[PDB]
Design a protein around this nucleic acid. Structure first.
Ligand SMILES: [Mg+2]
Ligand SMILES: [Mg+2]
Ligand SMILES: [Mg+2]
Ligand SMILES: [Mg+2]
Ligand SMILES: [Mg+2]
Ligand SMILES: [Mg+2]
Ligand SMILES: [Mg+2]
Ligand SMILES: [Mg+2]
Ligand SMILES: [Mg+2]
Length: 146
RNA sequence: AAGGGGACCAGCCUAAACCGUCCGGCUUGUCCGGGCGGGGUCGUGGGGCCCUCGGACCGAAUCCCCAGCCUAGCCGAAG
């Protein structure tokens, strides 16, 4: 199924390009998240340089990504979690980590964009990349304590 | 089944192009979408749009009135 990419993508295409995908990919992942739209003839006519209106949005969020690459890149996130001095009783999730950063540093961050494969269960200092924009990574230190 | 002989007899309205108007969208306009109005209905192809020459008859399956008919009856020859 042909789609119009509203956002840049990795190893797939570029914003405004018409690409071919399996229908399950488009209807269950790409379209519901806004990453693409159906390449219907109405949309194709409606593509009134929609890339230009989409290249601006990507540039708009690329102003804050670098801007937040200073306030949110000059801090260590310290969160105290109940533990037996070695192992956390519960865990720290991306929402919990984002809650700490928005309540101990006053900067909102999308918990989904954090690159955290599995929640943290062991006390220690952790580093992960916050990636709100392609080619603009933001490494962030995390500290969890008793 | 076609064909032949008879009964009966009648053909119409829409979608789409294009034009207007109201409402919604934000990917804010020659934009898309949803109502409604106009326009259009065909096989000898037809229609839309542009240019030219053009420019009263037919008539309901709808409505109105009347005839007739139905639901009680009456007159009716001569031991
Ligand atoms: Mg016959
Ligand atoms: Mg009509
Ligand atoms: Mg149609
Ligand atoms: Mg309309
Ligand atoms: Mg109409
Ligand atoms: Mg024709
Ligand atoms: Mg009698
Ligand atoms: Mg009598
Ligand atoms: Mg008698």
């Amino acid at each position: 199924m042909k789609v119009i990419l509203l956002e840049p993508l990795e190893n797939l295409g570029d914003v405004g390009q018409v690409v071919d995908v399996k229908p399950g990919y488009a209807r269950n992942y790409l379209l519901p998240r806004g990453l693409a739209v159906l390449a219907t003839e109405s949309n194709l006519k409606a593509l009134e340089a929609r890339i230009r209106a989409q290249a601006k949005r990507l540039a708009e969020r690329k102003a804050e990504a670098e801007r937040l690459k200073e306030i949110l890149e000059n801090l260590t996130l310290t969160i105290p979690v109940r533990a037996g001095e070695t192992k956390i009783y519960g865990s720290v999730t991306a929402k919990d980590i984002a809650e700490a950063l928005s309540r101990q540093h006053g900067v909102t961050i999308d918990p989904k964009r954090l690159a955290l494969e599995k929640p943290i269960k062991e006390l220690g200092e952790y580093v992960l990349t916050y990636k709100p924009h392609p080619e603009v990574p933001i490494q962030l230190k995390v500290s969890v304590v008793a």
